[PDB]
Design a protein around this ligand. Structure first.
Ligand SMILES: *[C@@H]1O[C@H](CO)[C@@H](O[C@@H]2O[C@H](CO)[C@@H](O[C@@H]3O[C@H](CO)[C@@H](O)[C@H](O)[C@@H]3O)[C@H](O)[C@H]2NC(C)=O)[C@H](O)[C@H]1NC(C)=O
Ligand SMILES: CC[C@H](C)[C@H](NC(C)=O)C(=O)N[C@@H](Cc1ccc(O)cc1)C(=O)N[C@@H](Cc1ccc(O)cc1)P(=O)(O)O
Ligand SMILES: *[C@@H]1O[C@H](CO)[C@@H](O[C@@H]2O[C@H](CO)[C@@H](O)[C@H](O)[C@H]2NC(C)=O)[C@H](O)[C@H]1NC(C)=O
Ligand SMILES: *[C@@H]1O[C@H](CO[C@@H]2O[C@@H](C)[C@@H](O)[C@@H](O)[C@@H]2O)[C@@H](O)[C@H](O)[C@H]1NC(C)=O
Ligand SMILES: O=C(O)CSCC(=O)O
Ligand SMILES: [Cl-]
Ligand SMILES: [Zn+2]
Length: 612
């Protein structure tokens, strides 16, 4: 790539490996910077030239990783793993893994070009109306808003079917080629497949057993929530479109992927007439904008004596969807340019309660970057990716409490009684409990694809098996193997792992319990607010500053006092609504689960032409 960035002479000792690590990280910052810079230029401004520059930067990275990774094994292949320094062998281990740099140039370009094509197709896909193909809808905000607020079966379906056909179908041939190239690359590193590489980041010999054990404890909660919500949908949409012993049609839960259910809170509220805990209409009434939401988030972090967002963030970030007519990736993201200075968020922010927590979630990533920027490049990661995803969510739990919402002016009164307490915990259940099966299943699908279990001829078949098995949902229309419904979820074509979200959703409640203890708080865990707790903030600062220097299991014991992940804090948090939901399901004579697994709803009568 460039002589200055290539490695020189180092001895085959542990002492030389320390010198090797320092020279690697120094040159790496420059390589990562141009790569992240070119990705930013593309994702905020999607064109052919920016894609070309993106791919050109991707090649240089692979050239860098090859030279240093090849030189690492040359010097340290047999002797590494036997070093006394835990931090060193972690760094050296990551360096010898070349990834897509194991491929020849011809295949490197194919690998890099596929990523850009899959990314381009996903973010530029549109849904046009069939009769008057003029006003085509994008995913964000148009289809997102339709799925959130529309209560028309036909309209919801048209949006769901349109998006899955638009994104999915053209992605399939490209995703097949990527999977083969990805496996070829990571097999030369000694992994069975790419999936095995992804799972290794959690450095646990019994990882799949642990996750499976956690979900078994969490399944009863989802089953009761599922049943209760199914009953409410039955009353709304009727006996034809809802089967009380079958799976719920996947377009009715208020979300394109049915990943979180908060948008149907109004339909399923236990005790209505009380102050609406969805503060979205108040935000719009008071005139909240994107800039307000990020600053409200920032203030929460600084109240814990964590770092404020630097000048570069406010200068560089994209906090609203451009009105220039530009084509942008609207999926929210948090950016580290590896120059210990430039940090940014790219978000097509809408003024809504769930977006306010998304803002917190994205700012949690940034806060992480800010806390470990002084560490060496290889250690600028979370203890595991799940830690990175859980920081912003932990604070959001405090923020969402009716007491805190009152303090920031979004809720006029909170009568502390049993009925308000059930209203809130159900709302949080629709956000947190509903997601668990989806967070768990996405990577199970991908682990099967990478391992060869799920060939192209079974992509959709295996996707909907897992969707039905875990979420208890069915496709609102018939699907075959021309469709590729997994590709209609951002993370699949953008090749970024999803298991971190299941880990994060379990872990954020372990964190929340630990911080409320250190805040000196007592009483029900779901009414805790760590706002302005410098003591709780000093606990968070230490884990964030650790980065990836210490193994996540020991980092977790210093914080929570336990070696591993644990479902108890999550169960403790929700206990009251769990008992309440079981009570209600028994009184309604509900069947938990979906015994009629084959059932699918019929089409609307004049769909699509006529209904529009
Ligand atoms: C809303 O109502 C709930 C239910 O009554 C309140 O929970 C109760 O809060 C009080 C005061 O914080 C807790 O008192 C504490 O009890 C422990 C004993 O475990 C004691 O060591 C402390 O010194 C303190 O006296 C009480 O435990 C707690 N009840 C339960 C069942 O957890 C809640 O505080 C109310 N929320 C608001 C904002 O007023
Ligand atoms: C093109 C660069 C990426 C956008 C970025 N990488 C860098 C070096 O800034 C990155 O992976 N950021 C992670 C948050 C994250 C970052 C690092 C971690 O170790 C873990 C999480 C992130 O923003 N994830 C988001 C989803 C996402 C993930 C990857 C993308 O390319 C785009 C969006 P979120 O989970 O907040 O919905
Ligand atoms: C979007 O990217 C394109 C390039 O892919 C940018 O277009 C160039 O802009 C520079 C700077 O003004 C001009 O000198 C070039 O003539 C343009 N080239 C082409 C091919 O159009 C464009 O500026 C970017 N848009 C934004 C808002 O940054
Ligand atoms: C896959 O399905 C395609 C379209 O689906 C069919 O027609 C639409 C309008 C709906 O009525 C739906 O229920 C039907 O299944 C077919 O055109 C295509 O041939 C199918 N692909 C394969 C390989 O069979
Ligand atoms: O809602 C979020 O952003 C957190 S869950 C991850 C996802 O979006 O798929
Ligand atoms: Cl992950
Ligand atoms: Zn995230």
């Amino acid at each position: 790539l460039d002589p200055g960035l290539q490695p020189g002479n180092f001895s085959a000792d542990e002492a030389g490996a320390q010198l090797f690590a320092q020279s690697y990280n120094s040159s790496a910052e420059q390589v990562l910077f141009q790569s992240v810079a070119a990705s930013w230029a593309h994702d905020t401004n999607i064109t052919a030239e920016n894609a070309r520059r993106q791919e050109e930067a991707a090649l240089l990275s692979q050239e860098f990783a090859e030279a240093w990774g090849q030189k690492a094994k040359e010097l340290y292949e047999p002797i590494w793993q036997n070093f006394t320094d835990p931090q060193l062998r972690r760094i050296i281990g990551a360096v010898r893994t070349l990834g897509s740099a194991n491929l020849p140039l011809a295949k490197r370009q194919q690998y890099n070009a596929l990523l850009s094509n899959m990314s381009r197709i996903y973010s530029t896909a549109k849904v046009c109306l069939p009769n008057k193909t003029a006003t085509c809808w994008s995913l964000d905000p148009d289809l997102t808003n339709i799925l959130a607020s529309s209560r028309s079966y036909a309209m919801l379906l048209f949006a769901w079917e349109g998006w899955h056909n638009a994104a999915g179908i053209p992605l399939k041939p490209l995703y097949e080629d990527f999977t083969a190239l990805s496996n070829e690359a990571y097999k030369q590193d000694g992994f069975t497949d790419t999936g095995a590489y992804w799972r290794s980041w959690y450095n646990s010999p019994t990882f799949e057993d642990d996750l499976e054990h956690l979900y078994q404890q969490l399944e009863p909660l989802y089953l009761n929530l599922h049943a209760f919500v199914r009953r409410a949908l039955h009353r709304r949409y009727g006996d034809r479109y809802i089967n009380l012993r079958g799976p719920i049609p996947a377009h009715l839960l208020g979300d394109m992927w049915a990943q979180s259910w908060e948008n149907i809170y109004d339909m399923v509220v236990p005790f209505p007439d009380k102050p609406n805990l969805d503060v979205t209409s108040t935000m719009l009434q008071q005139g909240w904008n994107a800039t307000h939401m990020f600053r409200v988030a920032e203030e929460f972090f600084t109240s814990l004596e964590l770092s404020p967002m630097p000048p570069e963030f406010w200068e560089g970030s994209m906090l609203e969807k451009p009105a220039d007519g530009r084509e942008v990736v609207c999926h929210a993201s948090a950016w580290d340019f590896y120059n210990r200075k430039d940090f940014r968020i790219k978000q097509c922010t809408r003024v809504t309660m769930d977006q306010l927590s998304t803002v917190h979630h994205e700012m949690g990533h940034i806060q992480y970057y800010l806390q470990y920027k002084d560490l060496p490049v290889s250690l600028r990661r979370g203890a595991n990716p799940g830690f990175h995803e859980a920081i912003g969510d932990v604070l959001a739990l405090s923020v969402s409490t009716p007491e805190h919402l009152h303090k920031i002016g979004l809720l006029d009164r909170v009568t502390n009684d049993t009925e308000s307490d059930i209203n809130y915990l159900l709302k949080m259940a629709l956000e947190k409990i509903a997601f668990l099966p989806f967070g768990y299943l996405v990577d199970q699908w991908r682990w099967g694809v990478f391992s060869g279990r799920t060939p192209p001829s079974r992509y959709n078949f295996d996707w909907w098996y897992l969707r039905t098995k875990y979420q208890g949902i069915c496709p609102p229309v018939t699907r075959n193997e021309t469709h590729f419904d997994a590709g209609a979820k951002f993370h699949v074509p953008n090749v970024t792992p999803y298991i971190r979200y299941f880990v994060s959703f379990v872990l954020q409640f372990q964190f929340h319990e630990a911080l409320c203890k250190e805040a000196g708080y007592e009483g029900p865990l779901h009414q805790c607010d760590i706002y302005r707790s410098t003591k709780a903030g000093a606990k968070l600062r230490k884990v964030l500053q650790a980065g990836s220097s210490r193994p996540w299991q020991e980092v977790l014991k210093d914080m929570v006092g336990l070696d591993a992940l644990d479902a108890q804090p999550l169960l403790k948090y929700f206990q009251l609504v769990t008992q309440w939901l079981q009570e209600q399901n028994q009184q309604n004579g509900e069947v938990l689960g979906w015994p009629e697994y084959q059932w699918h709803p019929p089409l609307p009568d004049n769909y699509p032409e006529g209904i529009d």
